[PDB]
Write a protein that binds this ligand. Structure first.
Ligand SMILES: Nc1ncnc2c1ncn2[C@@H]1O[C@H](COP(=O)(O)OP(=O)(O)OP(=O)(O)O)[C@@H](O)[C@H]1O
Ligand SMILES: Nc1ncnc2c1ncn2[C@@H]1O[C@H](COP(=O)(O)OP(=O)(O)O)[C@@H](O)[C@H]1O
Ligand SMILES: Nc1ncnc2c1ncn2[C@@H]1O[C@H](COP(=O)(O)OP(=O)(O)O)[C@@H](O)[C@H]1O
Ligand SMILES: Nc1ncnc2c1ncn2[C@@H]1O[C@H](COP(=O)(O)OP(=O)(O)O)[C@@H](O)[C@H]1O
Ligand SMILES: [Mg+2]
Ligand SMILES: [Mg+2]
Lengths: 145, 48, 1621, 97
């Protein structure tokens, strides 16, 4: 159950989803939680005094923001998502994301096209690390492209 | 009729205006450091 | 005797006047002909007023007064009877036609049944007697109509659920507002009333075509007039329900558009693949079918021809039939182009322009294909272009046509679009089409971003119209919350329409994140729907929106256009950006747009014109001086090209009229070839861009035009009729008018430019510094247009930033989702409704005030080609063609380019309003308007006397020119000085009139008047041009005037002129003649209302009396404690007709403070001319004194809401009542301001528009001589209690002045925020010494010095922070006392433990430390056993602190501000001392749920106890209790005044009044009125309530508190406890 | 004539693009042509060995990023920036070549 934070109805839906999932064991994801730091503090205080199901998981996807409460950061486990370090890592991540069944399709030339496209994406994204020369401005060349 | 002078007068005008503003502001800062004048809101911010 | 004749005529008219009645379904007889009665009453009122103007009005004054009375009663009755009738009609249409509302909502159905019974009884009673008066004189008729309106409006707001179900039934209802939806539902039977509601429901359907019976829908029509005739007409008799036959109309429109498109394609295939085309047949085909249909037919024909030609070349080595297609396209283009150069009807002209643009696109595409050597239809160079494929074989007519681009496939929606303006298919537009179609194929959204003016919204609209979709533009802003967007998305899903949410990023970022859910769910639903396995049999994909399952139509889409990097914008969350395919729109192809536009308008040299006009715009944008209001984007070019087309058309019409007038010789080709297109383009450019130019950019742009367009000149036409109207209007308004180079040529030229821009644009901006004639320019233009064209011109002046944006546009309740109209929205909706014929009048909505992106950006869709005002509840208001949006601003520093590019700019420099025009206006107004006939004669004579000086290069102008060279406390504006001078001269005229009145036997001669007027003019110039500067600048201005002037001046060598007044005898008399050495009474020494008269005191009192006598608002600016309030109250005492009311502005002051004061002290009354706000007392002038007018916060956009509110209430003479958006005009109210200099911290300089109206006088600190005189007078008065000490008054006051001067010098505001010293310290010093000396009968010199030193310590050492400062204070007190009092025994008088207490004796005598300590120990034991069992350890500082607190608790209105580290015992010591002094300690109990209402309740309780029960209370309050700024605001008001005006209201106010009456009876006073009782309550609260404020010694916290609540540092004695030493 | 003759560092000017526009329109007025018929002819030479004709203008301080200009021809270089000695820009008729 994925809920985007930012509205009061969003808070109510998130609370209901968490209260149902701690018993049913389902997963709950909340997006852009960095916009409501006080509700983050309340949610962390709620989480500390709780006994969840074995399979329950809570994902709090946020933007790197100093306004996020420190206690929530200490309570949870932090994953940082950011540009891959290099061309090789970028291609590795691109190939990992794409399902194997999709590349290995009936035309045998699809795989080479995918490799070329992944190399192009890696070059485009790695050039972005060089703001004045590689490009003219920090474009949003991302996974959607 | 000369576009050169049309642009050129604008250059000299802005240069003189901004030069006068900067010199007056810096003289005010110097006078504040010497204590001969009080600090105003704009002058206090500029000091900041 | 024509008065009696006209009155008899009107009597006969009204007696014969009968009320027209028409039936309604055999139920009742409605009133008809509202406009006739309305303008009959209006012209009768005008006639009666004109009679009142006549001198013979006296004999028929009573009769005309009674006639006005009954006419106003008719107005009052019929201004609400029409509303009641209409609302009953479209409520009965709901409560009778629909049967579901009975079971759904029965209770207000029964209520409406009763109301309808009452209304029909009233209507039948009216029908019995159709006479107007017999209807009018009915008892209780007005109250009955008002109650009916109240009840019907109550019912109308209680129909939301039924409206939601109706919107569910028919999807297109979602875009229809509350009132409009009830109107549609009620008037289903009366379809003639629904014609004005179709425009907001369909794309271009503005009205439907009905038969004679109004029972069969024959077809539809657009705003232009183009008609679509249904193949199978739909009969509403078979389908009575509104939604059913509306859906049938929609479906029949789709079907008939499909069939007509099929026929049109079949017909146009002949024109295609044809070597030659007959112009007559092609014109017939164009005329036969609609614009969108002919464009679609041309597109289909060209696409099929190109596909067929490409298929031929499949082998590669075949011929090139694409050349045949290109030749065919070129031939057709030539045919249409030759058709354009001759005249056509407007509809056919628009069709030709659309087809020419489309065929230019087709020719360019075909040329590109031929160049690219494309031979295969499957090549991407052909697939990327937008292709149309027609299937006449398809059984379903709607799927006959398929539109494809790349791999995307769409079906034409067949929604009638009307005649829309197509866009030139530039390469950027093609890129947009490709990207957006690719996004739609992936079931994503489109996000074309970029700087404003790049054709983002228009490109999306053009693409949506290309596919035949319903495109909606929503001007998004920060009140588009989650629920409103959910409702909008539900409407889009159910209708099947595109949503263009322009300015998407303006939303709150959290709201964007929330809306991401709805966007993602809709996109997933569409993605599932697009799967081919889904079939018609299964239910359509239902998405979950707002916890509701909503059917999602395939055709829907979501487009958002955002403008990055501007103000008032958010950043989109990444989970939202990934749902939209963004596209960059930065550089539109301006040259191609210009070329195609000019080619379609009929310009033969379009290529050269574009190649000369497009680099010209870059030349202007790069060479002209950079300014905030300059714009040279695509919108400016579009305006120029449209203006050029219009100018060409009017020139052709002029040539035709000339040729038909002079003989008969007309040839279209001869006119076309002989036509100066260069000149037309130059004229359009000058008419569009010259107004916005600054004075030094006009010749630059003219030379640029000469460089790019040599040989052509601009000869602006002379609007002789308009100039005559302007001359007449300027005559009637005492304005200076001049043609060309005369005085006033530039202003009238600007007025003509404004007229031209109003003619072109629907949005204007009169930009220019305050004092440039913008207001007068547009007022004169409006009146001239009214008097010229014969159409009545009205204006609604709205101040945008004087009220909150929620009050300006409206708001939505998050709980009930009910819409309340704002100020601007109400005005626009009322104009659109045209309930009283507002569409026939010229309506101008003028936004006089500051502009920032927060409020103006919601007008983006209004100023666009859309001309829509989009509301959060989904409603859109179409701008009427006669409405103009005007902005009257001084600067556009803070407005974004999106606003700048939308408004025609007219720049008013300060050179436009020459000082000579102001002088002439003043002289004419003086000669015409009486000031109170003797008044007129004296006033004209004075004007004649002042004429030589009020001239160019005269004394006044030269002095004003020298004035700006001086240093003023506030920035010097020309109109401020001029208005001050004019007011003072009017006061001089009134002084002459009073002198004549006091001397009936001997009126003033000419020589006295001449000398008096000359001397007073010099005096007024001196006190107006330098009244707001120091003494040195006043002296310098006096010296300059003495050098330049020629009138007599005082002969004194060293005495400055400003020291002299102008006596009524016409001679200079020094002000010192009015400064007596008065001897103050001993019991009145240093009393609050006692003023020692000195030079500055009398001068400023005279100046304030002069300004307030005119009811002219004024501001006294000076350092704190200088004497501004004292001077004002001293001057106001000479005006017994003016009652002053106290206001205390702070950092968080809002106009709600002024509104509460108005409610408390004034009352709103309904008058024939409108709502007038006047004081409750009759004949008294309320004076609102704002003590800290310049503290209110300036926003990030440089504005103060309360300052704008005051400026609106001063300049326009009133404000707007946001309860019902009714203009309220102030009566008998003026404003007086006081403020520290803006250079002081926390002080914000006032806007130049506000300073224009208010003179400023600078009240500086009294000098050492003035201080010596004043406090020597007090000391001599005080020292009469002790005859033996009478010789020490002079050294005592000398020592006090010396110590105060060194204390001011040593400690400044730089070190600490509270280090302020003023004569207030001397006043408290004298008060303390007098109170100490009052009970004692004898006392030696040493005792007096000891009291003096004790008060010096308690004043100058209490507030200090550092220990070194206190050591310096001690040493300086010692040295000063030794210097001024030699030969006294220092030890007895200056032992270091200087302590005074009245605890060990009945008298305030010095007390030794040990006995005081023992007494404090005993009292502490008693306190422990009684109140608080918290043991305390005594030390010297505790004794000092308790002595200080006891001192404060014994003074009236004595509040405390204790500053020190927490846990130092501040609260405990305060409670202990209050327990000694009998004060009942009150503390507010703060919890996490403590809010503003709880604080208000606590304040109410403490004020009730301390004002009605006469119970002394020590209100102890801590900074931890301050949870909101409202706490501090209420505390500030209570501390400064002793009463909170808005605290008591309604039930609580009546209860307080009863309690105050009981308390006054208990004290034995006889008061019964509410005003006197409230004054007594305020006095008791002042005398009884004490507030002790405790706070931590924060550095920045103290500075913030010094601005958010100035009262703590003025009314509260500040003690710095600090940490324990 | 002196205004046209002197060499101007484009970096020091507040709006160098307006300077370029001014010289463009000056030369256009000299040749009485239209702007879109005018292109750029840029010659990079040493200040000492420089001759300015009726259509030439002196520009100093232009920095070349990642290339070197020798005899009006560019060579890719590993140097970050290469200061152009003196930039002479001319306005001539378009040849649409
Ligand atoms: N044509 C005129 N001839 C003479 N006096 C004029 C004329 N037009 C305006 N004035 C006077 O000049 C002053 C300017 O008034 P106005 O309100 O038009 O100025 P403004 O520039 O629009 O000011 P603001 O920025 O406060 O709106 C007024 O005193 C007005 O009476
Ligand atoms: N391709 C085009 N052909 C003709 N006119 C255009 C074209 N694109 C844009 N325009 C004009 O430019 C203006 C663009 O306004 P708009 O699209 O609202 O700007 P934005 O969307 O960037 O705020 C419109 O008035 C339109 O008439
Ligand atoms: N001529 C004077 N005679 C007597 N008192 C004066 C005179 N001038 C100034 N004062 C004292 O100065 C104080 C001015 O206070 P106030 O008018 O409230 O200043 P502000 O309005 O600037 O806060 C008064 O308390 C008054 O006693
Ligand atoms: N002179 C003193 N001797 C002993 N204890 C003291 C003294 N002054 C204050 N205290 C202690 O301070 C406490 C009260 O602090 P309080 O006055 O509420 O702090 P604040 O002044 O910040 O409100 C009491 O419990 C008392 O024990
Ligand atoms: Mg737009
Ligand atoms: Mg004005």
């Amino acid at each position: 159950t994925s809920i985007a934070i930012g509205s009061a109805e969003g808070f109510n839906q998130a609370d209901k989803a968490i209260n149902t999932a701690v018993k049913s064991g389902r997963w709950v994801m909340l997006k852009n939680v960095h916009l409501a730091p006080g509700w983050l503090m309340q949610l962390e205080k709620k989480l500390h005094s709780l006994q969840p199901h074995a399979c329950f998981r809570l994902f709090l996807t946020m933007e790197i923001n100093p306004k996020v409460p420190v206690n929530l950061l200490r309570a949870g486990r932090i994953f940082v998502f950011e540009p891959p370090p290099g061309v090789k890592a970028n291609m590795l991540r691109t190939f990992s994301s794409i399902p194997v069944s999709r590349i290995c399709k009936s035309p045998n030339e699809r795989a080479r096209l995918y490799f070329l496209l992944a190399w192009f994406h890696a070059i485009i994204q790695e050039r972005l690390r060089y703001a004045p020369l590689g490009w003219s401005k920090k474009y949003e060349f991302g996974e959607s492209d | 009729k000369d576009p050169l002078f049309r642009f050129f007068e604008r250059e000299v005008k802005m240069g003189a205006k901004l030069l006068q503003d900067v010199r007056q502001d810096l003289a005010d800062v110097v006078q504040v450091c010497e204590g001969k004048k009080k600090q105003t809101n704009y002058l206090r911010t500029l000091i900041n | 005797m024509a008065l009696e004749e006209f009155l008899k005529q009107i009597r006969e008219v009204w007696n014969t006047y009968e009320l027209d009645l028409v039936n309604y379904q055999n139920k009742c007889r409605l009133i008809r002909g509202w406009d006739d009665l309305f303008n009959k009453v209006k012209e009768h009122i005008n006639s009666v007023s004109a009679m009142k103007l006549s001198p013979y009005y006296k004999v028929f004054e009573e009769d005309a007064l009674s006639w006005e009375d009954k006419l106003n009663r008719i107005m009052a009755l019929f201004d609400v009877w029409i509303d009641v009738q209409r609302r009953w009609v479209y409520l009965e249409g709901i409560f009778t036609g629909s049967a579901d509302i009975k079971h759904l909502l029965p209770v207000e159905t029964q209520r409406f049944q009763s109301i309808s019974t009452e209304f029909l009884a009233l209507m039948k009673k009216v029908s019995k007697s159709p006479l107007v008066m017999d209807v009018l004189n009915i008892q209780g008729v007005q109250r009955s109509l008002e109650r009916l309106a109240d009840l019907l409006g109550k019912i109308q707001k209680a129909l939301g659920e039924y409206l939601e179900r109706e919107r569910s039934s028919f999807p297109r209802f979602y875009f229809v507002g509350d009132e409009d939806l009830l109107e549609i539902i009620g008037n289903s039977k009366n379809v003639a009333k629904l014609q004005k509601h179709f425009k907001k429901m369909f794309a271009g359907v503005s009205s439907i075509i009905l038969n004679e019976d109004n029972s069969v829908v024959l077809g539809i029509s657009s705003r232009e007039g183009e008609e679509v005739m249904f193949k199978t007409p739909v009969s509403i008799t078979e389908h009575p329900k509104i939604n059913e036959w509306l859906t049938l109309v929609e479906k029949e429109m789709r079907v008939t558009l499909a069939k007509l498109l099929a026929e049109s394609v079949t017909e146009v295939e002949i024109f295609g693949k044809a070597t030659s085309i007959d112009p007559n047949t092609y014109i017939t085909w164009i005329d036969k079918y609609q614009a969108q249909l002919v464009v679609l037919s041309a597109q289909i024909a060209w696409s099929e021809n190109v596909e067929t030609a490409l298929s031929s070349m499949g082998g590669g080595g075949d011929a090139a039939p694409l050349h045949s297609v290109l030749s065919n396209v070129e031939v057709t283009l030539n045919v249409l182009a030759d058709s354009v150069l001759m005249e056509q009807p407007p509809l056919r002209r628009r069709k030709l322009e659309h087809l020419i643009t489309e065929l230019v696109h087709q020719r360019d595409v075909t040329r590109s294909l031929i160049k690219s050597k494309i031979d295969n239809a499957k090549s991407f160079e052909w697939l990327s272009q937008m292709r149309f494929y027609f299937d006449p074989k398809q059984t379903d007519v709607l799927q006959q046509l398929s539109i494809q681009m790349a791999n995307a496939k769409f079906n034409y929606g067949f929604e009638y679009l009307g005649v829309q303006d197509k866009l030139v298919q530039t390469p950027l537009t093609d890129r947009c089409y490709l990207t957006m179609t690719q996004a739609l194929e992936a079931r994503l959204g489109g996000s074309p971003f970029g700087p404003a003016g790049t054709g983002k919204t228009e490109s999306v609209k053009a693409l949506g119209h290309q596919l035949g979709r319903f495109v909606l533009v929503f001007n998004c802003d920060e009140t588009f919350d989650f629920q409103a967007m959910g409702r909008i998305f539900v409407g889009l899903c159910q209708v099947g329409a595109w949503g263009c949410f322009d300015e998407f990023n303006r939303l709150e970022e959290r709201m964007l994140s929330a809306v991401s859910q709805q966007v993602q769910c809709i996109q997933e639903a569409l993605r599932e729907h697009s799967n081919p396995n889904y079939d018609k049999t299964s239910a359509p994909i239902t998405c979950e929106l707002l916890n509701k399952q909503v059917k999602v139509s395939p055709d829907m889409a979501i487009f958002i256009t955002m403008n990055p990097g501007y103000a008032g914008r958010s950043n989109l969350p990444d989970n939202l950006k990934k749902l939209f395919r963004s596209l960059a729109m930065t550089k539109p192809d301006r040259q191609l747009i210009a070329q195609v536009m000019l080619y379609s308008q009929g310009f033969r040299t379009a290529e050269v014109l574009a190649n000369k006009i497009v680099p010209f715009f870059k030349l202007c944008d790069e060479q002209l001086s950079s300014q905030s209001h300059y714009d040279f984007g695509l919108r400016a070019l579009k305006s120029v090209l449209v203006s050029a087309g219009n100018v060409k058309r009017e020139r052709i019409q002029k040539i035709k009229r000339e040729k038909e007038e002079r003989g008969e010789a007309v040839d279209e080709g001869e006119i076309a070839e002989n036509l100066p297109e260069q000149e037309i383009l130059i004229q359009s450019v000058c008419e569009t861009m010259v107004p916005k130019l600054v004075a030094e950019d006009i010749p630059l742009l003219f030379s640029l035009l000469s460089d790019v367009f040599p040989g052509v000149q601009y000869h602006r036409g002379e609007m002789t009729a308009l100039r005559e109207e302007l001359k007449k209007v300027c005559q009637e308004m005492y304005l200076t008018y001049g043609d060309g180079e005369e005085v006033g040529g530039m202003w009238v030229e600007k007025v003509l430019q404004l007229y031209q821009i109003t003619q072109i644009n629907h949005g204007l901006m009169m930009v220019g510094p305050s004092g440039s004639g913008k207001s007068m320019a547009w007022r004169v233009l409006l009146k001239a247009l009214e008097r010229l064209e014969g159409v009545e011109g009205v204006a609604h002046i709205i101040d945008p930033k004087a009220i909150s944006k929620d009050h300006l546009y409206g708001t939505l309740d998050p709980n009930t989702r009910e819409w309340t109209d704002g100020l601007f929205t109400h005005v626009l909706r009322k104009i659109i409704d045209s309930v009283r014929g507002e569409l026939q009048k010229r309506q101008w909505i003028v936004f006089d005030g500051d502009v920032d992106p927060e409020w103006v950006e919601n007008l983006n869709s209004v100023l666009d080609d859309n001309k829509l005002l989009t509301l959060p509840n989904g409603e859109r208001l179409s701008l009427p063609p006669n409405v103009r949006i005007m902005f009257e601003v001084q600067d556009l520093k803070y407005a974004t380019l999106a606003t700048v590019s939308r408004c025609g700019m007219v720049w008013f420099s300060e050179d436009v309003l020459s000082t000579d025009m102001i002088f002439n206006n003043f002289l004419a107004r003086l000669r015409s308007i009486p000031l109170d006939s003797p008044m007129l004669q004296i006033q004209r004579d004075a004007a004649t006397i002042m004429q030589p000086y009020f001239t160019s290069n005269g004394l006044v102008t030269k002095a004003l020119e020298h004035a700006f060279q001086l240093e003023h406390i506030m920035d010097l504006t020309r109109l401020r000085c001029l208005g001050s001078l004019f007011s003072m001269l009017h006061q001089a005229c009134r002084n002459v009139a009073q002198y004549n009145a006091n001397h009936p036997d001997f009126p003033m001669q000419i020589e006295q008047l001449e000398r008096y007027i000359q001397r007073y003019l010099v005096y007024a110039i001196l006190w107006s041009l330098s009244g707001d500067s120091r003494l040195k600048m006043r002296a310098e201005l006096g010296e300059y005037i003495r050098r330049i002037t020629t009138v007599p001046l005082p002969t004194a060598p060293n005495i400055p002129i400003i020291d002299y007044e102008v006596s009524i005898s016409g001679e200079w008399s020094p002000w010192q003649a009015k400064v007596p050495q008065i001897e103050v009474e001993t019991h009145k020494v240093a009393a609050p209302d006692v003023v020692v008269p000195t030079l500055d005191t009398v001068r400023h009192e005279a100046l304030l009396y002069t300004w307030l006598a005119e009811h002219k608002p004024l501001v006294l600016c000076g350092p704190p404690g200088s004497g501004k309030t004292m001077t004002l109250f001293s001057a106001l005492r000479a005006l017994p007709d003016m009652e002053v009311v106290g206001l205390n502005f702070s950092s968080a002051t809002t106009p709600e403070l002024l509104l509460k004061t108005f409610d408390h002290y004034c009352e709103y009354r309904r008058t024939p001319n409108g709502v007038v706000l006047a004081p409750v007392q009759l004949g008294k002038w309320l004076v609102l004194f704002c003590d800290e007018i310049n503290l209110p916060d300036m926003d990030k956009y440089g504005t103060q809401r309360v300052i704008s509110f005051i400026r609106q209430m001063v300049e326009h003479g009133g404000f707007y009542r946001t309860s019902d958006q009714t203009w309220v005009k102030l009566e008998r109210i003026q404003f007086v301001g006081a403020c520290n200099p803006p250079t002081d911290p926390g002080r914000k300089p006032l806007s130049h528009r506000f300073l224009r109206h208010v003179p400023v006088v600078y009240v500086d600190y009294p000098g050492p001589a003035s201080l010596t005189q004043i406090y020597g007078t007090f000391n001599r008065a005080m020292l009469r209690l002790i005859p033996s000490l009478r010789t020490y008054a002079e050294p005592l006051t000398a020592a006090m002045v010396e110590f105060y001067t060194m204390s001011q010098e040593r400690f400044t505001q730089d070190t600490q925020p509270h280090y302020i010293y003023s004569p207030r310290e001397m006043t408290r010093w004298v008060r303390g010494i007098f109170e100490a000396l009052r009970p004692l009968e004898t006392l030696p010199v040493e005792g007096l010095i000891r009291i003096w030193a004790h008060e010096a310590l308690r004043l100058f050492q209490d507030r200090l922070v550092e220990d070194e400062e206190r050591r310096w204070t001690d040493e300086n007190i010692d040295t000063v006392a030794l210097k001024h009092f030699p030969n006294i025994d220092r030890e007895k008088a200056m032992s270091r433990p200087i302590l005074y207490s009245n605890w060990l004796s009945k008298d305030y005598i010095p007390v030794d430390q040990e006995e005081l300590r023992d007494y404090v120990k005993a009292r502490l034991k008693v306190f422990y056993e009684e109140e608080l069992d918290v043991p305390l350890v005594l030390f010297n500082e505790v004794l000092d602190h308790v002595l200080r607190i006891d001192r404060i608790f014994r003074q009236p209105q004595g509040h405390l501000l204790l500053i020190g580290v927490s846990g130092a015992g501040k609260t405990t010591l305060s409670r202990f001392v209050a327990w000694m002094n009998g004060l009942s300690v009150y503390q507010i109990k703060v919890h996490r749920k403590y809010t503003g209402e709880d604080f208000d309740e606590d304040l109410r309780t403490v004020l009730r106890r301390s004002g009605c029960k006469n119970e002394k209370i020590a209100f102890i309050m801590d900074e931890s209790n301050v949870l909101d700024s409202g706490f501090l605001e209420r505390m500030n008001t209570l501390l400064a005044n002793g009463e909170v005006p808005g605290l008591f209201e309604g039930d609580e106010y009546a209860t307080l009044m009863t309690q105050c009456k009981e308390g006054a009876q208990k004290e034995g006073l006889m008061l019964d009125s509410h005003e006197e009782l409230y004054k007594w309550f305020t006095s008791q609260v002042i005398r009884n309530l004490h507030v002790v404020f405790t706070m931590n010694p924060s550095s920045e916290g103290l500075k913030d508190r010094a601005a958010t609540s100035p009262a703590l540092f003025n009314r509260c004695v500040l003690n710095w406890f600090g940490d324990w030493s | 004539k002196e205004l046209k003759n002197i060499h101007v560092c484009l970096g020091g000017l507040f709006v160098p693009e307006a300077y370029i526009t001014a010289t463009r329109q000056y030369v256009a007025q000299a040749n009485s042509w239209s702007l879109e018929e005018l292109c750029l002819e840029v010659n990079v030479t040493t200040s000492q060995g420089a001759t300015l004709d009726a259509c030439s203008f002196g520009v100093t301080g232009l920095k070349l990023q990642g290339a070197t200009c020798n005899n009006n021809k560019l060579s890719l270089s590993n140097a970050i920036s290469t200061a152009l000695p003196l930039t002479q820009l001319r306005w001539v008729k378009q040849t649409n070549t």
